[PDB]
Enzyme design. Structure first.
Site, PDB file in Angstrom:
ATOM      1  N   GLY A 103       1.934   2.845  -2.220  1.00 17.86           N
ATOM      2  CA  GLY A 103       2.966   2.796  -3.262  1.00 17.86           C
ATOM      3  C   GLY A 103       4.264   2.032  -2.958  1.00 17.86           C
ATOM      4  N   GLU A 133      -8.897  -0.148  -7.690  1.00 19.06           N
ATOM      5  CA  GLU A 133      -8.826  -0.979  -6.458  1.00 19.06           C
ATOM      6  C   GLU A 133      -9.801  -0.404  -5.449  1.00 19.06           C
ATOM      7  OE1 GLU A 133      -5.204   1.227  -3.932  1.00 19.06           O
ATOM      8  OE2 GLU A 133      -5.106  -0.966  -4.327  1.00 19.06           O
ATOM      9  N   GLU A 182     -11.413   3.360  -5.869  1.00 18.91           N
ATOM     10  CA  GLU A 182     -10.453   4.102  -6.713  1.00 18.91           C
ATOM     11  C   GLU A 182     -10.778   3.856  -8.180  1.00 18.91           C
ATOM     12  OE1 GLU A 182      -6.580   3.775  -3.648  1.00 18.91           O
ATOM     13  OE2 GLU A 182      -6.366   3.295  -5.762  1.00 18.91           O
ATOM     14  N   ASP A 199      -7.302   7.124   2.607  1.00 25.65           N
ATOM     15  CA  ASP A 199      -6.497   8.285   2.915  1.00 25.65           C
ATOM     16  C   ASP A 199      -6.949   9.570   2.199  1.00 25.65           C
ATOM     17  OD1 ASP A 199      -5.321   7.439   0.370  1.00 25.65           O
ATOM     18  OD2 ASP A 199      -3.305   7.169   1.263  1.00 25.65           O
ATOM     19  N   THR A 200      -7.220   9.463   0.877  1.00 29.46           N
ATOM     20  CA  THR A 200      -7.625  10.643   0.123  1.00 29.46           C
ATOM     21  C   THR A 200      -8.888  11.243   0.699  1.00 29.46           C
ATOM     22  OG1 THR A 200      -8.911   9.465  -1.535  1.00 29.46           O
ATOM     23  CG2 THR A 200      -6.561   9.831  -2.006  1.00 29.46           C
ATOM     24  N   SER A 230       0.824  -1.202   0.000  1.00 31.68           N
ATOM     25  CA  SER A 230       0.000   0.000   0.000  1.00 31.68           C
ATOM     26  C   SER A 230       0.857   1.250   0.000  1.00 31.68           C
ATOM     27  CB  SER A 230      -1.024  -0.015   1.154  1.00 31.68           C
ATOM     28  OG  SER A 230      -0.939   1.166   1.903  1.00 31.68           O
ATOM     29  N   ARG A 235       3.993  10.198   6.847  1.00 27.47           N
ATOM     30  CA  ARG A 235       2.887  11.159   6.826  1.00 27.47           C
ATOM     31  C   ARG A 235       2.561  11.471   8.298  1.00 27.47           C
ATOM     32  NH1 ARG A 235      -2.252   8.575   4.628  1.00 27.47           N
ATOM     33  NH2 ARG A 235      -1.236   8.498   2.522  1.00 27.47           N
TER      34      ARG A 235
END
Ligand code: ATP
Ligand code: ATP
Ligand code: GAR
Ligand code: GAR
Ligand code: CL
Ligand code: CL
Ligand code: CL
Ligand code: CL
Ligand code: MG
Ligand code: MG
Ligand code: MG
Ligand code: MG
Ligand code: NA
Ligand code: NA
EC number: 6.3.1.21
Lengths: 384, 386
Positions: free
Chosen positions: B161, B273, B261, B280-281, B159, B357
């Protein structure tokens, strides 16, 4: 403004003195910033303690006990959440270097009806009711004569009407004076069209106001609140002016609850809470920043900039009356939905009447919002 | 629906498996309803642990460890907050009577790309990128050859990336494979040249499926940097996206909020996906809606009706993603990170060792463009030191 990371050595520490529903929201707002929260109260498992890093149970009216807790936690901010605390020790501690929100003096002054009423009426020269001070049944007696009827009686150390008496009759003075028990204040009735709470935030970028909050009181408890209360621009102007003067005179950064009476275009000051106020719970759904978020923003030395209001909104309390240590809430599915939410506090038990939660609603009109919130609160089945 | 009082005998107990910034808000929304919260993670003092009644630290990929903690705490709901958990144990436990949100099968299909991808493409016949799986370097090479360039290689379980490579030519083949070994089987997907990408936050609840307004987002190094709402789409694209999202959530099953997504090409929509939980977004919803994606997830899983969702106008989120090594992080210049129509969130993460983050800036404006700028600018103002 520099903030550390909670639980880490450079952590920024906030100590709440009072952990009820109001402190619960303040705690969440601190948490959202990684601020370390120590929740203090007189009983275990108080609402704010559920969301704090840690908690302490002490007698907050005991100055020595307060000093100990404070010294132990070394908070960067002491945030009173209730009126009932040892304000004298706050003064001392502040004097010792401690940061008390908004300031220790503001806490002391507002805690006593005499300090605050003199400040506003006398020093500030603002409109208030007619008033008088007395320190004996005799003095009570002779005062209440001075006021005349209709008339109000309150200990100078009263809250939620704790020990208050509405006096139309001479007979009451039996009751009255005894209930008041100490010393008291006697006020001369104001006939307003309505009352409002003007939530005023004092911060680094000056004083900003939330839209006026109207409310309905019953048996010493707010039942419903709404925003924005409809009033004249002129009346609103006057209210703002009164609020600014008061908050600036009290001093320090924080959100204040200014209580005012509205008679057409006239506005009269009543009192002020140097902290978030119950009626302001409508701001949990009606604004971008709730009164709790505003308080924290202010005390941390951060700028407010502006406050966005989302249209007609209301709050309605969930105020059952029973005795239990294992309360459950049923029929919840009928208390939430579009533009409608509820909060349940987490209070550990109840024994008599107690505010266990609140319903929040928005609508096209204030009348509609009130109804939606009232209905939702009524749908919740409180079981013991 | 019946709710107890936290810490009391009839308490309603929620266990979070994963205690990051997402679970933190789920915890706060539970707490706002007096729901008892137990925060579990692989490290101590994880964000959600700060706002939980009790916390535990265990190996979430260890099924026996999972069974011990669930047996110990007896939660009414197990709310996975991340994909990397012992999903077979969750299936087991669900069988044994536990309510896994949204359902145990949803967690199992999505923790590994193969499950969800094959379901979507093959069973649901939804449009997706081309793809092939590979569990050896050679097969990986055959895969790339069939897929073509450019293509993206990803580990099947990953996840934000991690372990991924944007392959433009054969020259990268070797390092790409290796690197997909740092972050097993992999997926090789054809690159979809989309106009923009979205997250359609879809709530499956007692009163049906509801959709939040589309959330646009910008990814970098396969990690989200900014998000905004609403993202403009044609009527046709929005209807297609909704149809796809509805199909996915219903197929995966159970009540909860899902982050679907999608890639948008004009009026055409392609599935990528899905998170069977808050995304998060979706943190933009902390400022943009009456009910944040966290509040909606809780509402749904508790069996309460959503009713409707209110969107306040153009808004955006921008991450606070510093790079340093410290176990005592501070944030200065906060007075230049908040103000009118501008807020921030600092997660409470105990340390950092590289990029992490640590917070998010949030803003509203009359247009998403302006909102995005205000959020980015504010995230930038934060002085991160350690
Ligand atoms: N002079 C007055 N004229 C008219 N109504 C009054 C007057 N004084 C008080 N009231 C009424 O009594 C209510 C509660 O009394 P008040 O606000 O003065 O103090 P309180 O009981 O301590 O409340 P709080 O909990 O806010 O501290 C007011 O909201 C108002 O409705
Ligand atoms: N086939 C593809 N074509 C085009 N872009 C893609 C493709 N797959 C992924 N991407 C790009 O890379 C980003 C990250 O990919 P993806 O969502 O699969 O990674 P992840 O590791 O699962 O991240 P997360 O689970 O945190 O969302 C996407 O949001 C998109 O910008
Ligand atoms: N009107 C003042 C007010 O609303 N105070 C709020 O109620 C608490 C006490 O509730 P409790 O009496 O049920 O413990 C206080 O701690 C504060 O949050
Ligand atoms: N897109 C996935 C995602 O956003 N996951 C979020 O990040 C956390 C892990 O962060 P960490 O790596 O900093 O501990 C998770 O717990 C979740 O909240
Ligand atoms: Cl203002
Ligand atoms: Cl994940
Ligand atoms: Cl909120
Ligand atoms: Cl400054
Ligand atoms: Mg008072
Ligand atoms: Mg009052
Ligand atoms: Mg993913
Ligand atoms: Mg993704
Ligand atoms: Na101060
Ligand atoms: Na389920």
């Amino acid at each position: 403004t520099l903030l550390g990371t909670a639980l880490r050595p450079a952590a920024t520490r906030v100590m709440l003195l009072g952990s009820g529903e109001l402190g619960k929201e303040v705690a969440i707002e601190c948490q959202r910033l990684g601020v370390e929260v120590i929740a203090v109260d007189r009983y275990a498992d108080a609402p704010a303690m559920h969301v704090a890093h840690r908690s302490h149970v002490i007698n907050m009216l005991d100055g020595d006990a307060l000093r100990r807790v404070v010294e132990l936690e070394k908070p960067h901010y002491i945030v009173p959440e209730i009126e009932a605390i040892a304000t004298d020790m706050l003064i001392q501690l502040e004097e010792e270097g401690l940061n008390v929100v908004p300031c220790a003096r503001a806490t002391k002054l507002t805690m006593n009806r005499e300090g605050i009423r003199r400040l506003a009426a006398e020093e500030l020269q603002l409109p208030t009711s007619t008033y008088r001070f007395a320190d004996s049944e005799s003095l009570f007696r002779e005062a209440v004569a001075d006021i005349g009827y209709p008339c109000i009686v309150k200990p100078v150390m009263s809250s939620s009407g704790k020990g208050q008496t509405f006096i139309r009759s001479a007979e009451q003075l039996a009751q009255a004076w005894k209930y008041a028990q100490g010393r008291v204040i006697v006020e001369g009735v104001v006939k307003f069209d309505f009352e409002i709470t003007l939530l005023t935030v004092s911060a680094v970028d000056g004083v900003h106001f939330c839209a006026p909050v109207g409310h309905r009181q019953e048996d010493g408890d707010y039942r419903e609140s709404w925003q924005p209360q409809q009033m004249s621009p002129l009346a609103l102007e006057r209210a703002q002016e009164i609020a600014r003067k008061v908050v600036l005179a009290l001093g320090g950064y924080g959100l204040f609850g200014v209580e005012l009476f509205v008679c057409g275009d006239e506005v009269i000051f009543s009192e002020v809470s140097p902290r978030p106020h119950d009626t302001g719970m409508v701001t949990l759904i009606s604004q971008d920043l709730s009164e709790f978020a505003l308080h924290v923003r202010a005390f941390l030395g951060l700028p407010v900039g502006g406050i966005r209001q989302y249209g007609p909104a209301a709050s309605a309390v969930i105020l059952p009356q029973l005795t239990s240590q294992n309360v459950t809430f049923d029929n919840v599915q009928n208390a939430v939905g579009a533009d409608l939410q509820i909060r349940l506090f987490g209070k550990p038990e109840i024994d008599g009447s107690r505010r266990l939660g609140v319903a929040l609603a928005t609508a096209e009109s204030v009348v509609d919002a009130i109804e939606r919130a009232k209905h939702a609160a009524g749908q919740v089945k409180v079981q013991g």
